[PDB]
Amino acid sequence: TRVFKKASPNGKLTVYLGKRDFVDHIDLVDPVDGVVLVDPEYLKERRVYVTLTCAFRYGREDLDVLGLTFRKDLFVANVQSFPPAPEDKKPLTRLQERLIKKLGEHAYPFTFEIPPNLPCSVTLQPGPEDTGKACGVDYEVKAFCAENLEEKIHKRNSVRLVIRKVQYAPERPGPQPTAETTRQFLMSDKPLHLEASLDKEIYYHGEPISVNVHVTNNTNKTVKKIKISVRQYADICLFNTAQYKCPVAMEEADDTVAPSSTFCKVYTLTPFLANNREKRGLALDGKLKHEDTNLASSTLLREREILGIIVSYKVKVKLVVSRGGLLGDLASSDVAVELPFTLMHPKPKEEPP
Amino acid sequence: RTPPSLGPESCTTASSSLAKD
Ligand SMILES: [Cl-]
């Protein structure tokens, strides 16, 4: 098999990892195990550390400096790989012992445990004129050489490797998303009934979503238009809290429901990125560098507020209803319904991306 | 202050062999 490696500019340090993507199984996350090869020909600093960092990267809205970003830490963990800690006595992973067997005594292991309730790797979509690193939430392993943790890290005496915390679709599909609502109007005795359902609860990226729509219009009013939309809900809990609902797919059917009649139709929508590139800030799955990634997968939670960006998706079905009559155009008569669903990648039967 | 960064300087991420056991 193969492994990843990356060296410091001066070659003095070389980080080895088994993989870049670490799976959050909700109950537990894959541990970040690796080794650090230290070249004694160039080492003098007498202490090599490794650090796991979950950070929110962002640009300042008030600064006009191209490519300028900042990283605010949400989670930091450290391990002193060199020299081996006098207190710490921990078992090696198989990957680690294989790496030691290959590299020799100069390779010192590091193992980070990612606690639950940490944000998954999410990148917010940049605008056409962004030249800096990808903004959002990302993980990073940084191995460096210093006298102590206070020391200002020389970039040449260090090496960073971007890693991602990811989640995959649950093996067992949830209950079929259905939703209904009944609107009774002022001047009408009979109600306007809206029923909607999706074909399933779990969808994969690039997969069609089928919205079964059934309207029972027993009122005097008229449904003029039916708007279907796939909306991305993003909750961003960081310094303060922000939220948005961004439509990532939509269809405006001129389907009309006459008074005292029923209507039934299946609408099919597929969320994809190509027609959403102008929407800066849109949530995407975490990037290693600047390579394309899909619309951000749904975040799977367990059982309060979580740092970072939490993504979810809902289908909205909206009936635009005629007005007029007693209250003229003052009172809205529209009728909507919402259907939450899960948008994720299938669990890899073979290899990571 | 909050660590600033000027994105476009690092070695390209490599890849080595690992024998089976
Ligand atoms: Cl969830």
Question: Is A5 labelled a binding residue?
Answer: no
Residue A315 and residue A219 share a domain: yes
Report CB contact under 8 Å: A1, B3. Answer: no
Per the structure, the complete domain to which residue A333 belongs is given by 175-348
Among A142, A172, A202, where does a domain finish?
A: A172
Distance A302 CA to ligand 1 centre (A): 7
Q: What is the dihedral of CA A182, A230, A203, A194, to 10 degrees?
A: 10
Q: Answer yes or no: do A20 and A85 share one domain.
A: yes
A/B interface, count of CB pairs below 8 Å: 65
Q: State the CATH number of the domain containing residue A314.
A: 2.60.40.640
Subunit contact A4:B3, Cβ cutoff 8 A: no
Residue A193 and residue A329 in one domain: yes
Would you say A200 is a known binding-site residue?
no
Q: A173: cis peptide before it, omega within 30°? A: no
Strands A335-343 and A202-203: parallel
A13 plus A156 within the same structural domain:
yes
Of A168, A160, A128, A158, the closest CA to residue A141 belongs to: A160
CA–CA separation, A297 vs A349, rounded Å? 18
Quickly list H helices, chain A. 94-103
Q: What distance in Å separates residue B21's CA from the closest CA in chain A? A: 8
Spatial distance between the Cα atoms of A110 and A88, rounded to a whole number of angstroms: 12
- Residue A90 included in any domain: yes
Distance CA A110, CA A115 (A): 16
Q: Residues A69, A81: one domain?
A: yes
Spatial distance between the Cα atoms of A238 and A11, rounded to a whole number of angstroms: 36
Q: Are residues A197 and A317 in the same domain?
A: yes
* CB within 8 Å: A3 and B16: yes
DSSP output for A126-188: PPTT--SPPPEEEEEEEEEE-SSSSSPPPGGGEEEEEEEEE----SS-----EEEEEE--SS-
Are residues A6 and A116 located together in one domain of the fold?
yes
| Residues A180, A95 share a domain | no
Helix (H, G, I), strand (E, B) or coil at A243: strand
CA-nearest of A168, A165, A113, A167 to A139 is: A165
- What is the structure's resolution, reported in angstroms to one decimal? 2.6
Give the domain CATH number at A165. Answer: 2.60.40.840
A165 appears as a binding residue in the annotation = no
Q: Which of A123, A146, A172 is the last residue of a domain?
A: A172
Domain endpoint, select from A172, A195, A224:
A172
Alpha-carbon distance of A244 to A231, in angstroms, equals 10
Q: Hey, are the CB atoms on B20 and A7 less than 8 Å from each other?
A: no
- Name the method of structure determination: X-ray
- Same domain? A141 vs A193: no
In chain A, where do the E strands start and end?
2-7, 13-17, 21-23, 32-38, 48-58, 68-82, 107-112, 122-124, 136-145, 158-166, 178-183, 192-198, 202-203, 209-217, 223-237, 241-253, 261-269, 283-285, 308-321, 335-343
CA distance A103 to chain B (A): 10
Residue A188 Cα distances to A179, A216, A217, A260, A323, angstroms: 23, 14, 11, 11, 12
Which of A16, A71, A131 lies nearest to residue B3, judging by beta carbons?
A71
Is A1 in contact with B20 (Cβ distance < 8 A)?
Answer: yes
Nearest to A185 by CA among A322, A316, A318: A322
Nearest residue in A to B6, CA atom: A68
- Alpha carbons A30 and A26: distance in angstroms, whole number: 10
Same domain, A22 and A156: yes
Task: Tell me: do A107 and A253 sit in the same domain.
Answer: no
Instruction: Give me the phi and psi of A155, to 5 degrees please.
Output: -65, -30
Q: How many CB atoms lie within 10 A of CB A241?
A: 9
Q: How many domains does chain A have?
A: 2
- Determine, yes or no, domain membership for A9: yes
Residue position matching structure tokens 């619309």? A295
Nearest Cα of chain B lies from the Cα of A296 at a distance, in angstroms, of: 23
In a domain, A353, yes or no: no
